[PDB]
Amino acid sequence: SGFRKMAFPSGKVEGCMVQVTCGTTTLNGLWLDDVVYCPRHVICTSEDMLNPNYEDLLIRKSNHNFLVQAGNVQLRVIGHSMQNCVLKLKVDTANPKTPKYKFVRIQPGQTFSVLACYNGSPSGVYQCAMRPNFTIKGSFLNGSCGSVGFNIDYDCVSFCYMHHMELPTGVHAGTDLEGNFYGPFVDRQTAQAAGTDTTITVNVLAWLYAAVINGDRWFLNRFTTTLNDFNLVAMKYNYEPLTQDHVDILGPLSAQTGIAVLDMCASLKELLQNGMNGRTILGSALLEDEFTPFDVVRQCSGVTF
Amino acid sequence: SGFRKMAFPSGKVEGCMVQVTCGTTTLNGLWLDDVVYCPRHVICTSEDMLNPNYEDLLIRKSNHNFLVQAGNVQLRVIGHSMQNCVLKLKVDTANPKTPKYKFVRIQPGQTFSVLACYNGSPSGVYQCAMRPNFTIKGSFLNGSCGSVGFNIDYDCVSFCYMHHMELPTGVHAGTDLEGNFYGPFVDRQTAQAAGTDTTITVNVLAWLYAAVINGDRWFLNRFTTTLNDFNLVAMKYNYEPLTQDHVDILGPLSAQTGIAVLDMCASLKELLQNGMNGRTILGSALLEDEFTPFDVVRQCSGVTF
Ligand SMILES: O=C(Nc1cncc2c1CCCC2)[C@@H]1CNS(=O)(=O)c2ccc(Cl)cc21
Ligand SMILES: [Cl-]
């Protein structure tokens, strides 16, 4: 029993964190094989951030302008190239602690663990979700740039995020490991803001199925709904539209509990209408949206209580 | 910016997790140097759990009765002894990945990270607090026994918890690494329940100081209070009494924000009486008590390991 927001063990990623310095800027890098990946704004000053010409700033740099430090050892840089918003530094030593890895681009609603680092040194790990507006509600201070997001399924680390910036509202934006930003963000100090955020509906439903598995049924009702009628209500509460793909993905949880997806949608419709009335679901007074249907199956038992 | 429940990087602990099997029982062990530490109930059957004479069960066992598996390699057991409720298995091989460590007993209110394991294989990491009633609200399924709790201080891992059992309310009980239980619990199938729990007041105040640092000030007021008057109100909402030690420990957060501890106590007094009124603090509708004053400082400063 028990339901916690759980991050993946950070060990396979800890052995990849290095410190990258270019002149006066110091952020984190990810050392995989003989390549170190870090944000391309490491080559930028605070004046350069308003309108940076990265191709023009990179052409003026040589390998020895980048200092890479893995623990107490200096790695020699023997090449440099740019791929979108990430800088790829070819180093002379292959990382002996390189795990089995993949670079994956995630979609809004997907969750991941973040290993927050400062000066190539990991300081903490936490779980979070890619928001529908493409931002992440993370915990990042100055110097955390280059901290990475990941999932570890089986013996494979799937890198899905690299931290690049903080928006004016305190939320965070960054790229996949190929340097492509999530959302309409640029690595430029411009007037950009996060779009209106919506609740990840398929994740709230998954968390309601997890509550039923842990013996919580107070929120269930004798009602059902059409998929269309549910969406007309949910969107009035800034909930993300629920697609037929979402209903299909919730299939195994519906079968395990014996509560049809549209029957759980009627419980959510009523929860939005009435609130909790002093009650909690899995120790929470709010409706949780950072657990995917796949996370619920991973953490929760196969036997319902 | 950002405030997340953050666990320590689990890497130094991951390299210590082994699988311990005795007959039909399979749980986790902690391999430090040439000793493997695991719950002593690994030597127990389901009939033995009712009234187990552990000295009598252990005298009937030989070294080869315990199978220890580190990754895909079998460790040969060459000795066995008991220390309170933990079994110490002397192995032939010293762990090459043994970190700098200490065994420490924590006090209720102190927090720690848990690396949840099944079959000597880590599957997740999460942060939690030792409740005032000595239980932990964790996330554990069958096979989790022997999962350990820890903090990191520089390069030193401080082991403070080993999981033993789940209580009928879904909460968890376990021992320090010397086999001494946290709470009035015993390692056996018997009628035991968690006592009435209280809110860790010094931790709620620390989390209110973290909200002010992140730009949340709606709960602040012009009022102050005496330590005695605050404790009379706290005693009514099942909150831990606040001592002068707690006030002293909150000193640095009081200086950083410019809000005296008794001024923050007047704000908490008003949240306990009148509620939140549709508002949230750091994205929460409940008052959070699993962040110590040190955790607030470490997360809002960037302390690396
Ligand atoms: O956003 C940025 N840094 C940063 C990253 N993570 C966490 C935190 C910060 C700043 C302090 C607070 C915590 C920088 C500088 N500020 S900026 O607006 O010039 C900017 C813009 C784009 C890019 Cl890609 C980068 C940046
Ligand atoms: Cl995805």
From Swiss-Prot, chains A, B:
<comment type="function">
    <text>Cleaves the C-terminus of replicase polyprotein at 11 sites. Recognizes substrates containing the core sequence [ILMVF]-Q-|-[SGACN]. Cleaves and inactivates human TRMT1, preventing tRNA guanine(26)-dimethylation of tRNAs. May cleave human NLRP1 in lung epithelial cells, thereby activating the NLRP1 inflammasome pathway. May cleave human GSDMD, triggering alternative GSDME-mediated epithelial cell death upon activation of the NLRP1 inflammasome, which may enhance the release interleukins 1B, 6, 16 and 18. Also able to bind an ADP-ribose-1''-phosphate (ADRP).</text>
</comment>
<feature type="cross-link" description="Glycyl lysine isopeptide (Lys-Gly) (interchain with G-Cter in ubiquitin)">
    <location>
        <position position="5"/>
    </location>
</feature>
<feature type="cross-link" description="Glycyl lysine isopeptide (Lys-Gly) (interchain with G-Cter in ubiquitin)">
    <location>
        <position position="90"/>
    </location>
</feature>
<comment type="subunit">
    <text>3CL-PRO exists as monomer and homodimer. Only the homodimer shows catalytic activity. Interacts with host FBXO22; this interaction promotes the proteasomal degradation of nsp5.</text>
</comment>
<protein>
    <recommendedName>
        <fullName>3C-like proteinase nsp5</fullName>
    </recommendedName>
</protein>
<feature type="active site" description="For 3CL-PRO activity">
    <location>
        <position position="41"/>
    </location>
</feature>
<feature type="active site" description="Nucleophile; for 3CL-PRO activity">
    <location>
        <position position="145"/>
    </location>
</feature>
<feature type="topological domain" description="Cytoplasmic">
    <location>
        <begin position="1"/>
        <end position="305"/>
    </location>
</feature>
<feature type="domain" description="Peptidase C30">
    <location>
        <begin position="1"/>
        <end position="305"/>
    </location>
</feature>
